[PDB]
Write a protein that binds this ligand. Structure first.
Ligand SMILES: *[C@H](O)[C@H](C[C@@H]1CCNC1=O)NC(=O)[C@H](CC(C)C)NC(=O)OC[C@@H]1C[C@H]1CC1CCCCC1
Ligand SMILES: *[C@H](O)[C@H](C[C@@H]1CCNC1=O)NC(=O)[C@H](CC(C)C)NC(=O)OC[C@@H]1C[C@H]1CC1CCCCC1
Lengths: 302, 302
């Protein structure tokens, strides 16, 4: 049996129309052109020899407007520049005529978003990831991908939440929000940095166990229950996020007739082992699908 | 460690600009508007009471041009209609001004393609799948999704390979090629149909074991080797596709210094069990990534 679950991204066309190339003569990376503003990682200003301890304030001072070359695949004349956190805000003389309705938001651990991977201002692929509890994502990015963007979509409105910055020693990725902050405790410097420990996203594991029930797979469901408070105490000792219920989880509980606390108990038992059994073809807990994924893909509920 | 592998779809914008809604008064589904032609599943002509044994030849005869309502989210005036296999070809009076460069191709088992899931002519998500050895895909489709399209991209050229038709009793999906044939032995009738048995895609399992080596994970590699001929004899007895090497696999062998026949032996041993170990965080063989995925995402080679 197939669960009906796939890694589903938003259609990317509206964001593709916003991608540009930004060059400073050292690095080339991607930017996001909205209205009269082009957003891009500030390490475009960095010569390669200084990526390990850049002094971005001094680099910024050393630039003028024509230090930046912006191209859409048009040349966009830069008429202002500023730095916000780990991002540059370039003002250009032409408003993007394809600017979608948009907001800037921060994504929280466990939540999914879509990524448009771009190289040299050209969109090359799209994928979806969940923000990990340690503020990394398990992405697919190579040299030249910085400035690739992550977003969610509410209706017609694109909520931009991520601009790609760097790969960590363990192959995971991180980037900035459009307030210029890096996710987590990371710095946009190419040096060893402590990485917080990752954790299983409990709410998403619950979502996946509900997807299993919705597919007729419920061997792991017993009358036994663990309260949210008790589970969260356990979680802190076992590399699980604390569980916080949402209306999307509640909708899964209503549809299946299985209580959240029954699946919190199940998780505690499954964590110790699947005892040779499988759940939706897996022998380990899956936390890469959200309650909203399950509601939308299996139940049709957005 | 993260492998650097994700399920990567093409950017969807060029195909989004080709999607329309087609209605006959019973069903509404999606169509693909290229040049002056709109392609859509022929069961748009079907009243719901007849989806189990439709007589499509008689339905076709009963239609006229204005039996079909085509809308882009514009109304497109239908000025000709024809049936090719399980698809209708509607001729419209306006050429799609956003028609990309395109071809029609058939996809083969093990190969990946991108899907744009659409409802009521509106793109709603994108995902990637591999064509299974039994000519199904493990997709995510609900009522109203027929006419959603699958495609690959070579350069600027979109190779359309799939138009969605139906869900099978086991939750998997199938559809047609743009020559009008259904993939596999399936019929576009809503009745019980025998499903061929699925198999592990050996070439993709080899690709994934190479991705593991490229990530520093090679515990399963021994000097022991199994020839292609011997492996393929084994595969026929063990629900594996026969292995056929390609230049993309050869490139992985060259980069890692590990021979194909070493990984064919590894597969034969791993099939019987991982003995408590993991490979790229999995306890079972993974066949949803292609040699080309591994070359592109990990090595940068398209
Ligand atoms: C921008 O395109 C680029 C994206 C990276 C490149 C490879 N994959 C990606 O996702 N980002 C960078 O090159 C970034 C630049 C700094 C933020 C200024 N540097 C980066 O990602 O470097 C990666 C290497 C692994 C980290 C340094 C090691 C850490 C562990 C100790 C040894 C050094
Ligand atoms: C078109 O949008 C639609 C897509 C389907 C609906 C649900 N998920 C999908 O992917 N396609 C159909 O509705 C299709 C129409 C026929 C081809 C004319 N019918 C379809 O997919 O029916 C699905 C149900 C499961 C199959 C019938 C059972 C088979 C096993 C025995 C019992 C009947």
């Amino acid at each position: 049996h197939h669960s009906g679950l796939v890694k589903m991204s938003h259609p990317s066309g509206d964001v593709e129309a916003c991608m540009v190339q930004v060059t400073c003569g050292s690095m080339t990376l991607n930017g996001l052109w909205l209205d009269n503003t082009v957003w891009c990682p500030r390490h475009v200003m960095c010569p390669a020899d200084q990526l390990s301890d850049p002094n971005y304030d001094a680099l910024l001072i050393s630039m003028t407007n024509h230090s930046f070359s912006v191209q859409k695949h048009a040349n966009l004349r830069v008429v202002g520049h500023a730095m916000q956190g780990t991002l540059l805000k370039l003002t250009v003389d032409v408003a993007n005529p394809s600017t979608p309705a948009y907001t800037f938001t921060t994504v929280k651990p466990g939540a999914a978003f879509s990524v448009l991977a771009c190289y040299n201002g050209r969109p090359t692929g799209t994928f979806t990831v969940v923000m990990r509890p340690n503020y990394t994502i398990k992405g697919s990015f190579l040299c030249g991908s910085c400035g690739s963007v992550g977003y969610t979509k509410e209706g017609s409105v694109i909520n931009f939440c991520y601009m790609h910055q760097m790969e960590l020693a363990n192959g995971t990725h991180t980037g900035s929000a459009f307030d210029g902050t890096m996710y987590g405790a990371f710095m946009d410097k190419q040096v060893h940095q402590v990485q917080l420990t990752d954790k299983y996203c409990s709410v998403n594991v619950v979502a996946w166990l509900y997807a299993a029930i919705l597919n007729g797979c419920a061997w792991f469901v017993k009358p036994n229950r663990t309260s949210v408070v008790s589970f969260n105490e356990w979680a802190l000792a076992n590399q699980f996020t604390e569980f916080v219920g949402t209306q999307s989880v509640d909708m899964l509980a209503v549809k299946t007739g299985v209580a959240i606390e029954q699946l919190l108990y199940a998780i505690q038992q499954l964590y110790t082992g699947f005892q040779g059994k499988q759940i939706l073809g897996s022998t380990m807990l899956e936390d890469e699908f959200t309650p909203e994924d399950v509601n939308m893909q299996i139940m049709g509920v957005v």
